[PDB]
Amino acid sequence: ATAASMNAVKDSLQRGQSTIDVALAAGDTITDLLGKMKEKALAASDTSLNTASF
Amino acid sequence: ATAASMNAVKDSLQRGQSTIDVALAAGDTITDLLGKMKEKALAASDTSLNTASF
Numbered sequence: 232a233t234a235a236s237m238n239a240v241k242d243s244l245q246r247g248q249s250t251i252d253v254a255l256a257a258g259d260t261i262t263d264l265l266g267k268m269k270e271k272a273l274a275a276s277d278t279s280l281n282t283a284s285f
Numbered sequence: 286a287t288a289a290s291m292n293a294v295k296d297s298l299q300r301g302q303s304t305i306d307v308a309l310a311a312g313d314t315i316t317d318l319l320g321k322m323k324e325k326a327l328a329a330s331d332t333s334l335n336t337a338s339f
Contacts, residue, residue: 277297
């Protein structure tokens with residue numbers, strides 16, 4: 232009975248791994264977006280821009 | 286992200302170079318006109334001129 236109980240443990244571990252995989256994909260896209268906004272903030276930091284570019 | 290962020294810095298430096306180039310062209314024109322004024326001032330400083338040429 233104890234040996235047969237391991238299947239639920241394996242299912243729970245695989246479920247956690249899938250959840251972390253989905254979170255990792257979301258984190259990848261979020262870091263891409265974060266880098267792009269840092270580029271935008273540096274570009275807008277310049278005082279030689281006109282109003283429209285800002 | 287830090288490496289990819291350098292494009293904004295490059296663009297800002299290029300914009301500064303373009304602004305300085307425009308300023309230097311206008312300054313070249315202004316110095317040419319200033320030399321012309323100095324020539325006219327020396328010409329008009331002569332006391333033998335009649336009122337018309339002055």
